[PDB]
Design a protein around this ligand. Structure first.
Ligand SMILES: Cc1ncc(C[n+]2c([C@@](C)(O)C(=O)O)sc(CCOP(=O)(O)OP(=O)(O)O)c2C)c(N)n1
Ligand SMILES: Cc1ncc(C[n+]2csc(CCOP(=O)(O)OP(=O)(O)O)c2C)c(N)n1
Ligand code: SF4
Ligand code: SF4
Ligand code: SF4
Ligand SMILES: [Mg+2]
Ligand SMILES: [Mg+2]
Lengths: 1164, 501, 167
């Protein structure tokens, strides 16, 4: 049958049918494969064995790989899905699985490896890192090929006994939606070699016919034993070839080990692999028809590399070959595929000039214009070798010049771009539009979706294609017949109408009339509309949704507007298909919700009005650009073009060679995405600063100023007298940053005044006023104040060093990290695990960590997902070594003829170098005496002072903070965290416990509670939550504390300060509410208060220092809960969606009572 | 000075001098490096920074690799020692360390990977599994070369900012005892680019001049950012070449990225790497004196592979080349070194018949009789390609036939075999005899020891050599001048007098 | 435990008088807990295929003594003693039951006989040293314990890395 799927679903479809067990672990962009396999098993989909697939989630891909190995050796057909860093961790087991000749298929959504930077996007770096393990390797070039070649892999591995890696390009194919022919399970079972399966069962570990495998071997037999598998690898090419003929007879689609396309007498041929083959064949069709003698060899079976099957499809007329590798091996002579082609042609004496290049790293665009550039390089007198395509390499001059732009799209193919807002329904509607068109017409349909790094308020760009011919355009849309803008704020911000065809359609969602078009639309946009004679349509979708009662949801409205003008299908047919999908989507919502969406369709058709623009729009002239402010060179050359969606134009000379970025760059973004912003009521404010404490974006802060410093304040900068003996004679004001606020509403909810001192007002109404207000508050001079930093009020007067990050509105993680920077950020180094905290904390080119007025601030680094604890441990060793080198130079200065005041500060530092306050005090004293002491010295004594000055950045004692999520701490990095805590080093571990893998969409974890439903746990998690805090207490010398900011501000303050001062390992497990819980983020602080009050989350502190004082180390800070446990679960969707459901809710309540009663015994 | 050491001690000697931190985790046969580095720190040996090396043991080599990254990024020169399954667990962090251009040297006693079976013995499977991480790769063929090239790696990585894997063959060199010239720490400090060290400190993570590293990047900038390190890899070959000249002027021993030995008009040449280069050169000396036009190219800097330095030492008279790889990549068209040689010669239009083979997997014996078989295959009318040497492959017919047995040991070299019992003192005594002879004579001394898998009561066979010429015989004793049997039970049980002259 | 337990060419694990005995496998140093976990999942999968073929035999024209042992095994397939008792009854009645059957009934009995090596409930044993359990494999050992699977982990604590020399 025909369905609209992506590569992931296409792969999981075949993997599910052919497997009994699937051990999985989430990693983008492979996790959708494991998610859908869990849902199918949850609803009882049967594989070819008549049973449901058993899905088991491990603690890491290393654990997943071992489970695959054991399951295979014991007699169960087992598969798994992974990519990128996950595939690296499976490499050790891959040698074993291949070495033991076990049938197996790994499905890989090929993704780049973390080098100078992390990239979740697609290339072959991961697959190439395992090409020597002995696995076979099969490449799929399209979503249709994923369906077919996944079947080829599963059938071939049973026959050959050689395990397979079936890989397809991450995102470019794994997330591309296409209408394909789906192969029925019943047809798969008719092709399976059942004799091969039964032989596999007989080789299983079984005590009734036992055997020994995996022995240790001496040099006398190891080499021979390793070569004994030679026949199995020699027979694999023919086995795969015969399987491809089986699939060919069933589907009609013919695959070979290497496939050729292009002129039979071609002289220039490109050898490539993966989705690039689709782009190359489309270009080859275009060039061959124009008379060029070019061709393409698609590599399907990369390993084992069959020389016979490669030469079989190479035309005898080939004189020059360009090999394209989607990877980079630095310092290597050439990339993998290039060296293979060069080798095989040498082994057979072919006089063919071979040239290799690199493309598409990290989902870099690879379009037909680049393909011609590769072909033109083969047509040159001396073809450039070791080249790159798709970048401008102005440093080493490896890039090919893209001279001209060609349009190789098949005639009759419709192309549309949709600019949407984060979670406004645009992407979901386009997926439904593809499903509508694919199911009811003969046209092929394709969809690809570009997402934003910002988690809330980001830009989404949808790329859709429909045509009478199969769609091989695995690249972004170049010339669009229709461009739709579902957010009017994008007008004048992004190049929306880029590349639109003459006479194309421009659909806009805005409240602007035809006359307001002259003043609202920019001149460059008006020129394109007029010169290209576009059909410009406008619709006020927001007005329609308000009047009907759908709020601001415009997804149904904008989809109706598309079909009305696109002329892809009859307008009357589309309306039926839209309303039919509404019944499928809103049928269970009720009669009221159903008819509202029906009215949305009807009202949208009548409201879509074509804008009749004057022809004089073609001559419009840009308006004079204002005098731009002097911004740093990085902001001007890097951050602005990247946020302007022009980062691909930046040449190689723009970037550092090691991925090092400046700090404090998010303050230049000023996204202004808030719908409402807090307005401060000075008369109701008690000056408690709790609003600044809970802000997940540091958008609201308190400001103090002497009355003289309030001179040039705007009239709206109303201040109040400062409360407290510390701030006597000063003015106070709570000021919000309107362009950086997210409109989450946490600060208004936490305000404890009798009358609310914060009220949510629309941004547009007060944006002009509050911007000048914030610009004045930010320019206020520093005020020396003696407020105790150990209190909530006093700590918020210190500058936040984490601001304006990309976390969601109301995130429960950033308030914890923001508070740490306010206490110790002056002297801390952060080792941050991969996860949400690394995405909002370190997504290029914007850095949310900033500096104070002295230029000091946290240094931030992210290594890997699994190594963060050991990463920070290594930092502690190095910092200790750097202080030791400084202490030696200071002790040498004591014997030098230096000033008596210099010797006093040196001795004071040497005695207190391991104390935070004393080392800063005497450290700053030495800094003040350094310039004068150097001037008064000469010769070797001056050199000794210059060495101290070179190391003055290590006088102040540092504070190592190891930050990461619960998935890192409870699963993949738990072994390393256990080791670093047990070592006794002076490190501080902060676990942001969201009880799921939050960044990757919300998958199951050991931090997930009993009965909670998450991805990979569709039926709910049976086993209870692992108690990480209890295991760290078992050492006795590890400080462990469980905190929750929403529950108790004072309890969080005490545990953080006690943990940092403790000269040893400290573990802070913080409850972080998240969007994956299925709750209203406006009341994110309130949800954490209900969690502790209902006995769901405990609050305790284990202080090893109390044991040395003869006291009880365990202190239970909240003993008696006052709220109902069952009522808290019903306030989050992650528990209500389960409603077998009642049995799990009862087990969760029994575990919460036993956990509280166990803490009462440890406290008594 | 001259001391009797093994490859492990020779490497740890240099690693200790040039490093401040060493995060370690045990794995045969690399753990002796971390053991002896731990003992030196306990007795207060000073490095070139005047302090003792800080040794930290982790929960695994993956934890060790992560600790290296953190220590380097925080401003301390850090090293580690690993092999085989341990190096695999370090592969993820190697991408980060190489990607961030951090100076570093991993010392690896190259050991086979666990496939159909575990093997603690030596081959290049582990090092080849990381050849795409972006680390440089430097191969030493003897105990003396371990001393010298470990210094080359530590000096080169500071200058190039490209991290190095300095690897030597497990057991065959890591546990081979030889009398070598030991390089003084004071002489090492006279060659260090101290400007490079201070610059490395300035890039460290520090809150007083903060920065962000290890970001996540979208498709708009990732490709460009990955190619921005191209100058650093292009400059690494010349940096290594110049560093080798620094060591050359100090020690008198001349290393190059690729070294040539054999007839200047040779027509058959073997390209190889590791301890096989010693065995091949010894055989080449024997064949060249017999009139055969044969030669040998030793690969020192495997990555980055400099085509210019490789073609520089390849005689124009070469017609046929046999490449020997000490690894197996099942299903691959050819093994790594074979594909590099095949590629570079194709890129330069050389009409040279190239043939690749596999040898010495899991410390399989590789002796001169096998080397001649490789040369004889190049002399055949149709040379067999994709071959094996040292085994009898009667299934797929890849093995070369060992036609005749030759003795290529330099004349005047004494050779002794000692058959001992487990822990009866024989091995320790032979080691002491080597130290006695090495410290008090002008003779070179070599010791290699075959152990048993049984922990108590096993058979041990010691192979010792002494001669007036340097001992390149990285293979078991073929013709012994003396054979000693320290256990009468072996009489009638084992072929003790096998091969005695 | 893998060197004295599985160094080629000698295997110390042997079989009993009936030819049954422990099947031995070693994967890697770090993955042993998850290794045995995967085996437990597979054996459970292999028992389900046999149990389904036995339930089909209840509805087939076979002898009453054959059906009596099948119902007894299906009720006690997860008990060590009961599954062996009724399992051996099935094995003893199989050759005669196959002789008295034909067609699809004979094929259904031949499928029971093909899987009779899964009648007796298996005992998965995860054996390793203190280095595996306390260090490199602790994360995997922690996970398999949390899963609740019916596995038996035996940690031979020598308080050192005995094989590699005593680290
Ligand atoms: C070894 C390994 N395995 C899996 C991953 C994928 N991966 C992540 C990314 C950022 O790399 C990604 O989304 O691509 S983030 C992530 C889970 C994060 O879970 P945590 O609970 O630790 O942090 P939070 O995101 O705050 O919930 C995973 C599994 C990874 N990066 N490395
Ligand atoms: C991944 C990996 N790292 C290191 C090694 C080397 N190695 C083999 S056994 C062993 C330690 C065994 O210690 P233990 O778990 O206590 O078992 P024991 O020998 O003491 O019985 C090590 C480090 C290895 N084989 N694999
Ligand atoms: S509404 Fe949310 S983002 Fe805006 S200032 Fe308040 S807490 Fe911060
Ligand atoms: S929470 Fe309310 S009372 Fe407290 S400082 Fe903020 S606005 Fe003022
Ligand atoms: S933790 Fe949850 S709320 Fe915070 S950024 Fe991640 S997904 Fe968004
Ligand atoms: Mg989490
Ligand atoms: Mg032990």
């Amino acid at each position: 049958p025909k369905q609209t799927l992506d590569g992931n679903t296409a792969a999981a479809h075949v993997a599910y049918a052919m497997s009994e067990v699937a051990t999985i672990y989430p990693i983008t962009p492979s996790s959708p494969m494991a998610e859908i396999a869990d849902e199918w098993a949850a609803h009882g989909r049967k594989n070819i064995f008549g049973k449901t697939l058993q899905v088991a989630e491990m603690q890491s891909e290393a654990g997943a790989a071992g489970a695959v190995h054991g399951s295979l050796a014991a007699g169960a057909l087992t598969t798994t899905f992974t990519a990128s860093q996950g595939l690296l961790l499976m490499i050790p087991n891959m040698y074993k699985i291949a070495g033991e000749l076990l049938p197996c298929v790994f499905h890989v959504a090929a993704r780049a490896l973390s080098t100078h930077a992390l990239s979740i996007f697609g290339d072959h770096a991961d697959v190439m890192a395992a090409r020597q393990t002995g696995f076979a390797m099969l490449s799929s070039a399209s979503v249709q090929e994923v369906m077919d070649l996944a079947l080829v892999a599963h059938l071939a591995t049973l026959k050959a006994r050689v395990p397979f890696v079936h890989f397809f390009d991450g995102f470019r194919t794994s997330h591309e939606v296409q209408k394909i022919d789906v192969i029925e399970y019943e047809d798969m079972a008719k092709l399976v070699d059942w004799d091969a399966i039964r032989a596999f069962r007989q080789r299983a570990l079984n005590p009734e016919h036992p055997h020994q495998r995996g022995t240790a071997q001496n040099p006398d037999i190891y080499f021979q034993s390793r070569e004994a598998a030679n026949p199995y690898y020699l027979a694999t090419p023919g086995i795969v070839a015969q399987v491809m003929e089986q699939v060919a007879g069933l589907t009609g689609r013919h695959y070979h080990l290497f496939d050729y396309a292009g002129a039979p007498d071609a002289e220039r041929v490109i050898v490539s692999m993966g989705s690039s083959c689709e782009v190359i064949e489309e270009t080859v069709n275009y060039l061959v028809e124009k008379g060029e003698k070019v061709g393409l060899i698609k590599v399907r079976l990369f390993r084992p590399f069959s020389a016979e099957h490669f030469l079989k499809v190479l035309p005898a007329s080939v004189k020059r070959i360009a090999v394209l590798d989607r990877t980079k091996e630095p310092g290597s002579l050439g990339e993998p595929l290039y060296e293979d082609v060069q080798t095989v042609l040498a082994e057979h004496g072919k006089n063919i000039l071979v040239v290799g290049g690199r493309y598409g790293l990290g989902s870099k665009e690879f379009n037909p214009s680049m393909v011609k550039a590769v072909f033109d390089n083969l047509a040159a007198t001396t073809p450039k070798n070791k080249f790159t395509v798709g970048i401008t390499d102005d440093v080493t001059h490896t890039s090919l010049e893209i001279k001209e732009h060609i349009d190789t799209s098949p005639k009759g193919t419709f192309r549309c771009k949709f600019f949407g807002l984060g979670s406004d329904g645009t992407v979901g509607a386009n997926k439904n539009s593809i499903k509508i068109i694919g199911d009811h017409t003969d046209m092929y349909a394709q969809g690809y979706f570009v997402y934003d790094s910002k988690k809330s308020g980001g830009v989404t760009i949808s790329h859709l294609r429909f045509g009478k011919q199969p769609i091989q355009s695995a690249y972004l849309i170049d010339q669009a017949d229709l461009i739709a803008c579902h957010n009017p704020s994008y007008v004048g911000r992004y190049n929306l109408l880029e590349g639109i065809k003459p006479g194309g359609i421009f659909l806009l969602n805005s409240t602007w009339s035809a006359e307001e078009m002259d003043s609202r639309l920019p001149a460059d946009m008006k020129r394109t509309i007029a010169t290209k004679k576009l059909k410009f349509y406008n619709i006020d979708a927001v007005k329609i949704a308000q009047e009907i009662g759908l709020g601001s949801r415009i997804n149904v409205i904008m989809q109706t507007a598309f079909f009305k003008i696109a002329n892809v299908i009859p307008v009357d047919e589309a309306i039926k298909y839209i309303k039919d999908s509404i019944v499928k989507t809103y049928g269970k919502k009720g009669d009221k919700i159903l008819n509202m969406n029906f009215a949305a369709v009807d009202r949208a058709l009548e409201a879509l009005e074509e804008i009749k623009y004057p022809a004089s729009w073609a001559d419009a002239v840009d308006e004079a650009a204002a005098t731009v402010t002097e911004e740093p060179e990085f902001i001007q050359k890097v951050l602005r073009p990247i946020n302007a969606l022009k980062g691909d134009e930046l040449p190689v000379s723009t970037f550092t060679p090691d991925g090092v970025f400046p700090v404090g760059t998010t303050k230049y973004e000023k996204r202004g995405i808030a719908v409402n912003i807090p307005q401060w009521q000075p008369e109701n404010c008690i000056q408690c600063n709790q609003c600044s404490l809970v802000c997940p974006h540091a958008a609201i802060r308190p400001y103090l100023a002497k009355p003289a410093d309030l001179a040039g304040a705007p009239e709206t900068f109303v201040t109040k007298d400062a409360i407290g003996k510390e701030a006597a004679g000063l003015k106070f004001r709570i000021q919000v940053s309107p362009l950086d606020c997210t409109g989450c509403g946490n600060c208004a909810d936490v305000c404890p005044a009798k009358v609310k001192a914060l009220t949510m007002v629309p941004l547009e109404e007060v944006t002009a006023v509050e911007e000048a207000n914030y610009n004045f508050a930010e320019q206020l001079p520093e005020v020396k104040v003696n407020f105790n930093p150990a209190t909530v009020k006093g700590s918020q007067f210190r500058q936040p060093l984490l601001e304006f990050s990309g976390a969601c509105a109301g995130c429960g993680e950033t308030p914890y990290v923001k508070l740490v920077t306010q206490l110790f950020g002056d002297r801390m180094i952060i080792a941050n695990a991969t996860g949400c905290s690394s995405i909002w904390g370190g997504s290029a080119p914007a850095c949310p960590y900033t500096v104070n007025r002295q230029g000091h601030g946290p240094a931030w680094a992210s290594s890997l997902f699994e190594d963060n604890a050991e990463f920070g441990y290594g930092m502690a060793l190095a910092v200790a070594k750097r202080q030791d080198e400084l202490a030696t130079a200071i002790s040498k200065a004591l014997e030098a003829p230096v000033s008596a005041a210099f010797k006093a500060a040196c001795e004071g530092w040497l005695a207190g170098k391991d104390d935070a306050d004393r080392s800063r005090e005497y450290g700053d004293r030495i800094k003040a005496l350094l310039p004068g002491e150097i001037s008064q010295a000469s010769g070797e004594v001056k050199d000794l002072l210059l060495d101290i000055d070179r190391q003055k950045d290590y006088l102040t004692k540092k504070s190592i903070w190891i930050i990461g999520g619960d998935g890192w701490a409870y699963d993949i990095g738990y072994g390393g965290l256990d080791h670093v805590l047990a070592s006794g080093a002076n490190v501080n571990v902060l676990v942001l416990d969201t009880e799921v893998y939050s960044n990757t969409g919300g998958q199951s974890s050991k931090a997930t509670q009993t009965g909670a439903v998450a991805r990979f746990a569709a039926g709910g998690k049976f086993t209870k939550k692992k108690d990480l805090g209890l295991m760290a207490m078992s050492y006795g010398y590890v400080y462990v504390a469980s905190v929750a900011m929403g529950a108790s501000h004072s309890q969080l303050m005490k545990a953080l300060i006690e943990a940092e001062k403790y000269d040893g390992p400290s573990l802070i497990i913080a409850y972080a509410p998240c969007i994956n819980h299925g709750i209203n983020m406006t009341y994110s602080q309130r949800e954490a208060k209900k969690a502790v009050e209902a006995g769901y989350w405990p609050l305790y502190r284990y202080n090893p220092q109390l044991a040395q004082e003869g006291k009880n180390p365990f202190i239970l800070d909240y003993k008696t809960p006052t709220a109902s446990f069952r009522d808290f679960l019903m306030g989050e969707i992650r528990y209500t969606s389960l409603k077998k459901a009642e049995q799990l809710f009862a087990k969760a309540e029994a575990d919460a009572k036993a956990r509280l009663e166990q803490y009462k015994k440890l406290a008594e």
